[PDB]
Amino acid sequence: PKKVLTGVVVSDKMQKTVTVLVERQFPHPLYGKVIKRSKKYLAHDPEEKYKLGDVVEIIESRPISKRKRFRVLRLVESGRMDLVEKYLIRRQNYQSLSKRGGKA
């Protein structure tokens, strides 16, 4: 079966492509506690239909470009920028960790 993943659109910044963030809980091999971990998929949105913060199912599919091998299947749950802002702060923090620091 073509793998189907469910995630959150965190990018509209391209044409006919949305970036989906897909989490996955699983117990850790050695230490056992259940760890989150998540990966961004570039997904194909030909209609620029899905918006920033939509929750979408994504489907394994024939290549559309480098990076793009999934197309956006159905809409699951409409808007929610909580997950986005979450992901947004995550990336913003990167500003601090380097050789310098201050007021981000």
Partner 1 sequence: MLTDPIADMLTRIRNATRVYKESTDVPASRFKEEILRILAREGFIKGYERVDVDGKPYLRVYLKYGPRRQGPDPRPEQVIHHIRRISKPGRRVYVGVKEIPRVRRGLGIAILSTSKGVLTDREARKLGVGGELICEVW
Partner 2 sequence: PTINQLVRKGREKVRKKSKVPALKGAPFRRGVCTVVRTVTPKKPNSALRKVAKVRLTSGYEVTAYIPGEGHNLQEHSVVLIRGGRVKDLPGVRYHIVRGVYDAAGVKDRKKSRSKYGTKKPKEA
Partner RNA sequence: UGUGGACCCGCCCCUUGGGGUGUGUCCAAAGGGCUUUGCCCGCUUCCGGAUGGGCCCGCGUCCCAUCAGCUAGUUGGUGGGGUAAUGGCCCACCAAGGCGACGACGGGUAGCCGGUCUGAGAGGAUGGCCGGCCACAGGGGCACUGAGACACGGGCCCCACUCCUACGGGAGGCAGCAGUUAGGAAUCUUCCGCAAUGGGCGCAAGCCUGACGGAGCGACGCCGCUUGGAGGAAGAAGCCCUUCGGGGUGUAAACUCCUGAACCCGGGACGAAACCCCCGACGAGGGGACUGACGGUACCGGGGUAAUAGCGCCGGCCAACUCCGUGCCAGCAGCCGCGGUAAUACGGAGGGCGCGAGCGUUACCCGGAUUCACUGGGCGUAAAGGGCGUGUAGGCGGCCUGGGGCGUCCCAUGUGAAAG
Note the residues at the interface with partner 2 (CB under 8 A): 28, 30-33, 35
Give the residue with the Cβ less far from partner 2, 35 or 88: 35
26 or 62: whose CB is closer to partner 2?
Answer: 26
Helix/strand/coil for 100: coil
- β-bridge partners, 58: 5, 72
Q: Which is nearer to partner 2, 33 or 66 (CB)?
A: 33
Tell me, what amino acid is at 65? S
44 binds, among RNA, partner 1, partner 2, none (CB under 5 to 8 A by kind): RNA
- Residue whose C-alpha is closest to residue 78's, from 54, 104, 102, 103: 54
What percent of the chain is helix, strand and coil (3-state, nearest 5)?
15, 40, 45
Residue span 34-53 as binding mask against partner 1, x where in contact by CB under 8 A, dash where not: x-------------------
CA end-to-end span of the chain, whole Å?
Answer: 45
Interface with partner 1 (CB under 8 A), residue from 1, 29, 32, 102: 32
Nearer to partner 2, 31 or 100 (CB): 31
